[PDB]
Design a protein around this ligand. Structure first.
Ligand SMILES: *[C@]1(O)O[C@H](CO)[C@@H](O)[C@H](O)[C@H]1NC(C)=O
Ligand SMILES: *[C@@H]1O[C@H](CO)[C@@H](O)[C@H](O)[C@H]1NC(C)=O
Lengths: 152, 152
């Protein structure tokens, strides 16, 4: 089966990153969702680690769904993954998402997920911090979530 | 004196963001440095919160200095600031940095600083987690630091 493909020349992939990637495997089969806003402008976010996250769109690790019409916006693809480790957290990044084409310009979207250390849970509390959705215009997608895996 | 200029309109800056900004004022007159790599390829990083960080450049909140010749690269300007608050951390973003004229593309550089909560210190432990420097080619600048200000 397919997994996350690190950003770099096939092989040049830092041993370090690959170590982090492996550390996250227990989350692979899991799925994280979050719904924000109020009707008719409610949006939903589905996040998966190195797995398909959308129903329709393919290759997405994080998708934004407009509930009023079910349209899926790819925020990041797991075939362009970057992963870093800070003091007591891990930052996961999915690049190559659908382009803005609005006040944000036309660069591609990327998904940034802050995985904070929480010794009391495998993985939960997934929620958006910064978004580009409706009235919210950050031109940036930042998500946070808890996991004992990110504990150093 | 010149402070950070939030990204957005002009009087459409979010109270929320302006709230975080004021929250960080105690660090305005501080300076943070970090030196990495080995000679002849040592690079130095200087970071300031809403204050000038360069010695030759201007409008920069975070600069990358090549020590073999003193050339100052601006990674982010505090006139294009974005700030977000997570569960127990604050993320400061400086946009509008010199453009990548290499393998990274030609988009402008941006400075991303992870400010984690540490009740035992006002501010310290400024360190680079991700960089575009020398043979390190992340095409991303991620920094981390400790500060009780980011608490709660
Ligand atoms: C990856 O993102 O998959 C999409 C699928 O459409 C391609 O368009 C990209 O070129 C792929 N990027 C890389 C670096 O493999
Ligand atoms: C920030 O200052 C630089 C200085 O050259 C300028 O080019 C840039 O347009 C400014 N950005 C904003 C949003 O004012």
């Amino acid at each position: 089966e397919k997994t996350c493909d690190l950003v770099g020349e096939k092989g040049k992939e830092s041993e370090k990153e690959l170590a982090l990637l492996k550390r996250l495997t227990p989350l692979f089969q899991k799925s994280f969702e979050s719904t924000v806003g109020q009707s008719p402008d409610m949006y939903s976010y589905v996040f998966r680690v190195c797995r398909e996250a959308g129903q329709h769109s393919s290759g997405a690790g994080l998708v934004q769904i407009q509930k009023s019409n079910g349209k899926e916006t790819v925020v990041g693809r797991f075939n362009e993954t970057q992963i870093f480790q800070g003091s007591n957290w891990i930052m996961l990044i999915y690049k190559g998402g659908d382009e803005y084409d609005n006040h944000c310009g036309r660069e591609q979207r990327r998904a940034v997920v802050m995985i904070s250390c929480n010794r009391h849970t495998l993985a939960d509390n997934f929620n958006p911090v910064s978004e580009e959705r409706g009235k919210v215009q950050d031109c940036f997608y930042l998500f946070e979530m808890d996991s004992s895996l990110a504990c150093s």
